[model samples]
Target: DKATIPSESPFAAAEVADGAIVVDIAKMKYETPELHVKVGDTVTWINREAMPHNVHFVAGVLGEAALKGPMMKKEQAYSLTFTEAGTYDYHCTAHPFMRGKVVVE
Candidate 1:
């Protein structure tokens, strides 16, 4: 239960599995262990819960920017490629508490 709290930027691991990154949204909360990857990496945030979620960069940042998804859809996916090496913070415009980070290297 304690492990559910999302960690800060620059997660313990830098590389993700061989598939689209998964992000679960529920009641204005984002399941933790924020997605991490290298430069040129593409991350797909899938909406697995029953709610409308939009992916947008944390105000005042760089990279591919913002994206939105199909509301109430299980397979909805949003992808972004990190070209520059830096830490990117993002959250759902619908749920600001649903935050995540991307570390490009």
Candidate 2:
């Protein structure tokens, strides 16, 4: 599972961007619930709220090394570089239900 974004869900990314893919963490959730990225691309997770947050991965959820390894404080960021193609599911360890996935092809 990936990060469950808060209400006002109207975000859609059609294709991959050239630079880093951004995931904004705010409002007690991830602003973008679904994400798509290419292999070798780096998805950058940013905590935009005034509280602590982290992009943690659950084991065996998608790919191995599921947990990118730590939590982030407000305004902090973590960049995860994908080395293969797979549906990567992750969640905010701060919460038990926050979930999301990345489609990599």
Candidate topping TM-score: 2
Candidate 1 ranges beyond 4 A from true positions: 1-19, 26-28, 63-72
Q: What is the lDDT of residue 48 in candidate 2?
A: 69
List, residue by residue over 1-105, the lDDT tens digit for candidate 2: 232222111222333245868888778877888898877777877776766666666676544435654566655666667767778767777685777777878
Question: Model 2, residue 86: displacement in angstroms?
Answer: 0.8
Clashing pairs in 2: 1-90, 1-100, 2-99, 2-100, 3-99, 3-100
Write candidate 1's Cα lDDT for 5-104 as tens digits.
Answer: 1212212122333654555555456664366677666665556566766666643466233433334344354555556677767777766767777676
Q: All candidates' TM-scores?
A: 0.62, 0.73
Give the clash count for each candidate.
0, 6
- TM-score for candidate 2: 0.73
Residue 43 CA error for candidate 2 (Å)? 0.2
